[PDB]
């Protein structure tokens, strides 16, 4: 049975790895377990750059802490500029994998928010409203009018990161 | 070795999935993992009989042979919150499985979209065997099973079963809709 | 001088869900996609799975006869069986016929009394303030997106012709 | 009678996969889509995020000179940066515009040394009938749990977010 460290304890996320490895590997035994481990950077990202260095960061300490797993999974979500996107990182012992997923343009009041220092979740709660957030879904669940979700764009990202694990041959470590 | 100790992880609650097939177990993670992205389980493969033929040869078989692995499943392997069991069968020339979702209380249940066979699948009925003898072996493999090859890989065995289980779980998605 | 694909309704959803079955076995594929309404010979609300196949084989028939010369023929129909509901889909060409059923799924004890007392949609409308399937998955699936499913399935003769025939 | 809408391409893919967004956020509606072809004014590989973003811009632009009144104009661009590579779709109406990036896939490295026109090499690497008939690059390198088709859908339904929100994304 093997082991997958996710680099987060937030229930989303270590579900998101789930579906992602119960989907592409569905003839192996594995075994999650989440973690909560220091990104080294700011609590919400506000560059390409540095959302991707954070999920890259969560990794390396993940596998610090906790030597010996099958893989270690990295996902932070970031901001730059008018758009919010998540970096996904897979790596195994020898290679890795990686896959920033489809960007999200937020709306002209949102940016202005986060202008003033604002954390995002707060703002869209300001903006959409915390109820029709949560019965929607989510943000993009509410925007999209349920033919996305975070978790459906999360999905493909994560996929996309797998693709040299999938695919040996092509990727050499 | 250098895994956090069990004791420290997170509390969560057992799904019990009546298989001890990797696919199975996996396809019933993906489904509750998509559907409820805020809870998470435990998922746990259990080997219980279904009391009906190792191939169902009729709808109602087939869904007995699932409901059948719920039930002893809840008997021999007491204490999880849902307990899943997934079925394949046949009826004249369509193949089809069976899900059903028990919590305590209550019964979710779906029986995936079917698919024609071809005649000599049929006629020459192992499904698995007859499957690799008329398509082959390699083909069946490097195509992601028959539902794969037969679509062109727009749908495998997985991606229905998918449907058909998060159709098995909306009384537990919708309490108020499907009194227990 | 562009090849015809006739649907066995003008309910558009059923039109569209035809349009990207299509679309997505044979993208290089051209084709005119026409809805067209004809008699089911069945109950308005089919009350078993063996009359709601029916009615869809009956669509298919009664389209092919008032328009011929079409490369495909589509049914598709709805209907319930105790406590599920699913749909049948049918397509036929001139000498092919493949077929499937829909995942089926639980409908609300309220439902079914309400619907046992008469549409569906005014039904559902009422009781929950994507189709059925998108309020009852809360959008983990739609009606499009599992009826997509079975129509795929039901392409299967057509696409492998050495193995059905 | 009916609107049409521009695609800033004549790639029938690029065209269907446009048709398809737009048939399932507007499942009510119906248009004429229209593939043209109108210059990028940027490399014929973009090598950046920005070029490729700007290229899609700037097509859409041409796209709106070229052919005036139209309902909605669709740039679908796709480019490499390090390693990655991904699209940039960018949809206008007459008042507003909706846009976002496709998730990104590393490239294997036999295919980046080659570039060293990625259609050509993907062609040239996995063969012309492969990536025609397998749902592209991302439907042989993920096994078919994703194709182009479907990472493509899930872009343009985000751009097209200001045009069913209104109300939040005003158009000044």
Redesign the interface.
């Known amino acids: 049975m093997r082991?997958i460290?996710i680099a987060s304890?937030n229930?989303?996320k270590?579900?998101?790895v789930?579906?992602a490895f119960?989907?592409?590997?569905?003839?192996?035994?594995?075994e999650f377990?989440?973690?909560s481990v220091p990104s080294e950077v700011a609590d919400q990202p506000m560059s390409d750059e540095e959302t991707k260095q954070g999920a890259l960061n969560r990794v390396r300490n993940a596998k610090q802490?906790?030597?010996?797993?099958e893989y270690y999974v990295g996902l932070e979500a970031g901001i730059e500029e008018n758009?919010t996107?998540a970096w996904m990182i897979v790596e195994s012992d020898q290679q890795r994998?990686?896959?920033?997923?489809?960007?999200?343009?937020l709306?002209?009041?949102v940016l202005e928010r986060l202008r003033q220092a604002k954390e995002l979740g707060d703002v869209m709660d300001e903006?959409?409203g915390t109820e029709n957030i949560k019965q929607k879904?989510g943000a993009?669940?509410l925007?999209?009018?349920?033919?996305?979700?975070r978790?459906?764009?999360y999905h493909?990202?994560l996929?996309?990161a797998?693709?040299?694990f999938?695919?040996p041959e092509?990727?050499?470590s």
Not at 65 to 69: E, Q, S, Y
Not at 97 to 105: I, Q, T
Not at 143 to 149: A, I
Request: charged share 15%.
């Open positions: 082991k460290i304890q229930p989303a270590v579900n998101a789930r579906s119960s989907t592409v590997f569905p003839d192996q035994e594995w377990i989440g973690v802490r906790h030597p010996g797993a758009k996107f994998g990686e896959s920033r997923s489809a960007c999200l343009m709306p002209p009041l903006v959409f879904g993009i669940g925007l999209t009018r349920h033919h996305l979700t978790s459906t764009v493909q990202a996929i996309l797998l693709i040299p999938i695919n092509h990727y050499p």
